[PDB]
Enzyme design. Structure first.
Site, mmCIF file in Angstrom:
data_model
loop_
_atom_site.group_PDB
_atom_site.id
_atom_site.type_symbol
_atom_site.label_atom_id
_atom_site.label_comp_id
_atom_site.label_asym_id
_atom_site.label_seq_id
_atom_site.Cartn_x
_atom_site.Cartn_y
_atom_site.Cartn_z
ATOM 1 N N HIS A 41 0.808 -1.224 0.000
ATOM 2 C CA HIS A 41 0.000 0.000 0.000
ATOM 3 C C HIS A 41 0.842 1.275 0.000
ATOM 4 O O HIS A 41 0.262 2.369 0.031
ATOM 5 C CB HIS A 41 -1.017 0.017 1.168
ATOM 6 N N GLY A 143 3.121 5.811 10.387
ATOM 7 C CA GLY A 143 4.477 5.649 9.898
ATOM 8 C C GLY A 143 5.177 4.365 10.307
ATOM 9 O O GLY A 143 6.294 4.118 9.841
ATOM 10 N N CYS A 145 4.338 1.284 9.592
ATOM 11 C CA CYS A 145 4.171 0.184 8.643
ATOM 12 C C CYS A 145 5.517 -0.256 8.078
ATOM 13 O O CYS A 145 6.415 0.566 7.862
ATOM 14 C CB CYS A 145 3.222 0.608 7.519
HETATM 15 C C1 LIG Z 1 0.935 2.331 8.087
HETATM 16 O O1 LIG Z 1 2.080 2.955 8.682
HETATM 17 C C2 LIG Z 1 -0.327 2.502 8.945
HETATM 18 C C3 LIG Z 1 -0.094 2.172 10.435
HETATM 19 C C4 LIG Z 1 -1.332 2.398 11.314
HETATM 20 C C5 LIG Z 1 -1.610 3.873 11.571
HETATM 21 C C6 LIG Z 1 -2.118 3.934 13.020
HETATM 22 N N1 LIG Z 1 -1.648 2.698 13.614
HETATM 23 C C7 LIG Z 1 -1.227 1.827 12.710
HETATM 24 O O2 LIG Z 1 -0.816 0.698 12.966
HETATM 25 N N2 LIG Z 1 -1.343 1.643 8.323
HETATM 26 C C8 LIG Z 1 -2.333 2.193 7.626
HETATM 27 O O3 LIG Z 1 -2.376 3.400 7.441
HETATM 28 C C9 LIG Z 1 -3.415 1.304 7.069
HETATM 29 C C10 LIG Z 1 -3.377 1.365 5.532
HETATM 30 C C11 LIG Z 1 -4.594 2.194 5.125
HETATM 31 C C12 LIG Z 1 -5.429 2.469 6.373
HETATM 32 N N3 LIG Z 1 -4.723 1.812 7.474
HETATM 33 C C13 LIG Z 1 -5.177 1.629 8.719
HETATM 34 O O4 LIG Z 1 -4.537 1.002 9.564
HETATM 35 C C14 LIG Z 1 -6.549 2.191 9.017
HETATM 36 N N4 LIG Z 1 -7.378 1.152 9.589
HETATM 37 C C15 LIG Z 1 -8.363 0.568 8.904
HETATM 38 O O5 LIG Z 1 -8.764 0.945 7.812
HETATM 39 O O6 LIG Z 1 -8.985 -0.590 9.503
HETATM 40 C C16 LIG Z 1 -10.149 -1.032 8.785
HETATM 41 C C17 LIG Z 1 -11.395 -0.563 9.512
HETATM 42 C C18 LIG Z 1 -10.124 -2.556 8.715
HETATM 43 C C19 LIG Z 1 -6.540 3.418 9.937
HETATM 44 C C20 LIG Z 1 -7.968 3.902 10.152
HETATM 45 C C21 LIG Z 1 -5.951 3.096 11.309
HETATM 46 C C22 LIG Z 1 -5.716 4.545 9.325
HETATM 47 C C23 LIG Z 1 -4.518 0.716 4.724
HETATM 48 C C24 LIG Z 1 -4.107 0.378 3.287
HETATM 49 C C25 LIG Z 1 -5.256 -0.407 5.455
#
Ligand code: A1ARN
Ligand code: A1ARN
EC number: 3.4.19.12
Lengths: 306, 306
Positions: A41, A143, A145
């Site tokens: 991603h 950040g 990830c």
């Molecule tokens: C990458 O560094 C981040 C790390 C997250 C940010 C806060 N804590 C973490 O572990 N990962 C993402 O941004 C990830 C990618 C975008 C949206 N997310 C999320 O983790 C989101 N969660 C989410 O959509 O869960 C659904 C409901 C299943 C969110 C809301 C925390 C930003 C991707 C591609 C999934």
């Protein structure tokens, strides 16, 4: 003596972390020989992430779109490919700090160390377990990830987790190093939920053995129980079933303490039925379930690595 | 989100550990530039340790009596001297992996990371605090003497502890890197005891702020209290007094959450008087006291090192 939640020394993994930038997204990657591994991603934007088609998005990228920073040295990309949910970026330089390593996909209940990183720079190290519902209870911010989880055996680093996302209940989800998610989760910003969790019975028993090795003995009794009668009480309190395979794994700890496995089960049953009544075990007021039988033996015996 | 007991990355310290052998005693040493630091009781035997005169024992040693092993490379000693309770062995080779570093002597209540080692090889890493009675609740076995505790700030390693001995209650005692013991303890096998411990009030409050940052809020109330009335309840439950200096240090956490420090004190008072009544905070059923206000801010904000 003493007993602590202990992580592996992290130096072999620190020497592999790098920064990967594409468009407006920055995250961490893992540099082993001449390839950098990171979550796919990174090719998305804050509107691509709602329902992306990653194949169609990757065929629009060129090598020079990927910015890879190792310290204050720039690695340039010379090829790229996608494998499940991870990118593999081939670079023109092999990492001279590459340890001996393997990729492994772990079972629920196993533990590992996490090196949390931001912008390719390590922040801290802590111990985790893969929960029965395939989430992990970690500590991760924007950040983080691309941070990895790992075990060490002698001189070999076995990588088992890469971090991708956070769920609404505050727990975390990710993949093995070949990009396959643990659990039913997908890398899409849509409604998904963890499913109900349970307590890891075999690990709780291992931790009660650790308490005895270290001098805590107030919770033992003279009773015993059958495996089936124990599992009938366990289901009631939302514990996982104990198999004969679990019993067999707890053999060495049983032999060192002199307490048969099913006698320790009778002690857990009484703790589940009566509570702790104001007492603690190894400094805890709850029954702890993120130490494996292997974890107890390494710490109570003194195994090192190299 | 999430909150874990997090240690510093340990790679900078792993590259400094060595093995020191003299007579029938083996322990760990710390190799920085061309000097190796280790505990002075390495010159003792299992009958010297009852009441030794270390000055009189050191004047009987030659350089070649000290065997120093760095990996499978032998360093030979070219001089030696004693400083308080540590030996300094000068060797003919400077450690090329020497990080930027300092020696510091910490106050009770401060936290640090411990890299536990056996025969010069690292075993694991965990987080500790210096208790009010100048012991640490660690995890140490035979051969772990010379393992060090440390903090990291940017690229600089601040060493603050070297391990020496275990007391009958299962807790641990040692020195700063200049060889001065923390507490009233001496490196002699005679009766000594820890003195009664207390709970680190300022740290408990910092951890309640961490809970709020992360979504736990059930323990708050609308009451408040004066500093003096709070300290009258604290003494009753064996907590340390809270000073105005402590109040001031908790300023940033107060400003980020919107909860005045003395309002959080009224919440702790109610928790001390009523218990938790079956609920948990940040996955704990006890009030936790080994996170400083600094620890909370680094983990809830995301600071790295390099
Ligand atoms: C990458 O560094 C981040 C790390 C997250 C940010 C806060 N804590 C973490 O572990 N990962 C993402 O941004 C990830 C990618 C975008 C949206 N997310 C999320 O983790 C989101 N969660 C989410 O959509 O869960 C659904 C409901 C299943 C969110 C809301 C925390 C930003 C991707 C591609 C999934
Ligand atoms: C050095 O590696 C060991 C580490 C100990 C061994 C078990 N856990 C540890 O942390 N230190 C010593 O052997 C130390 C040196 C000899 C005796 N000890 C002890 O730690 C003893 N404790 C002791 O005498 O405490 C008294 C009652 C104050 C003991 C019984 C654990 C071996 C010296 C020089 C103190």
């Amino acid at each position: 003596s003493g007993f602590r939640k202990m992580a592996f020394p992290s130096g072999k993994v620190e020497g592999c972390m790098v920064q990967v930038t594409c468009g407006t997204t920055t995250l961490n990657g893992l540099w082993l020989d001449d390839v950098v591994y990171c979550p796919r991603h990174v090719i998305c934007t804050s509107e691509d992430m709602l329902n992306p088609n990653y194949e169609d998005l990757l065929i629009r990228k060129s090598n020079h779109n990927f910015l890879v920073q190792a310290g204050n040295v720039q690695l340039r990309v010379i090829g790229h490919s996608m494998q499940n949910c991870v990118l593999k970026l081939k670079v023109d330089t092999a990492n001279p700090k590459t340890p001996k390593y393997k990729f492994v996909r772990i079972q629920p209940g196993q533990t590992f160390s996490v090196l949390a990183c931001y912008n390719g720079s390590p922040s801290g190290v802590y111990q985790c377990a893969m929960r029965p519902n395939f989430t992990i209870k970690g500590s991760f911010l924007n950040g983080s990830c691309g941070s990895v989880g790992f075990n060490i055996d002698y001189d070999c680093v076995s990588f088992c987790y890469m971090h991708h996302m956070e769920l609404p209940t505050g727990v975390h989800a990710g993949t093995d190093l070949e990009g396959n998610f643990y659990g039913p989760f997908v890398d899409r910003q849509t409604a998904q939920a963890a499913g109900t969790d349970t307590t890891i019975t075999v690990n709780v028993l291992a931790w009660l053995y650790a308490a005895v090795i270290n001098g805590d003995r107030w919770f033992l009794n003279r009773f015993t129980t059958t495996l089936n009668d124990f599992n009938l009480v366990a289901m009631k309190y939302n514990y996982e079933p104990l198999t004969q395979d679990h019993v067999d794994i707890l053999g060495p700890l049983s032999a060192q303490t002199g307490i048969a496995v099913l006698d320790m089960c009778a002690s857990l049953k009484e703790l589940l039925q009566n509570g702790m009544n104001g007492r603690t075990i190894l400094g805890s007021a709850l029954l702890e379930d993120e130490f494996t039988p292997f974890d107890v033996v390494r710490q109570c015996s003194g195994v090192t690595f190299q």
